[PDB]
Amino acid sequence: PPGPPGPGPRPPGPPGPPGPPG
Amino acid sequence: PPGPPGPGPRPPGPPGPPGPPG
Amino acid sequence: PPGPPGPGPRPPGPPGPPGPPG
């Protein structure tokens, strides 16, 4: 008969924007 | 009596922080 | 049969580049 559903593993986000202007 | 359990797929994280001060 | 698949948790991205000089 049918089995129950199996959560997957945890990639990184993209880089942040450039820092504060000097 | 049930079948065996089915892991799901691995999303990307949020943007990184702003970089260091200029 | 085995059940259906179970998505996992979403790291923050790296810091951005240095801010522009001023």
Side-chain angles (χ1 to χ4, degrees), chain C:
Chain C
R10 84 183 300 191

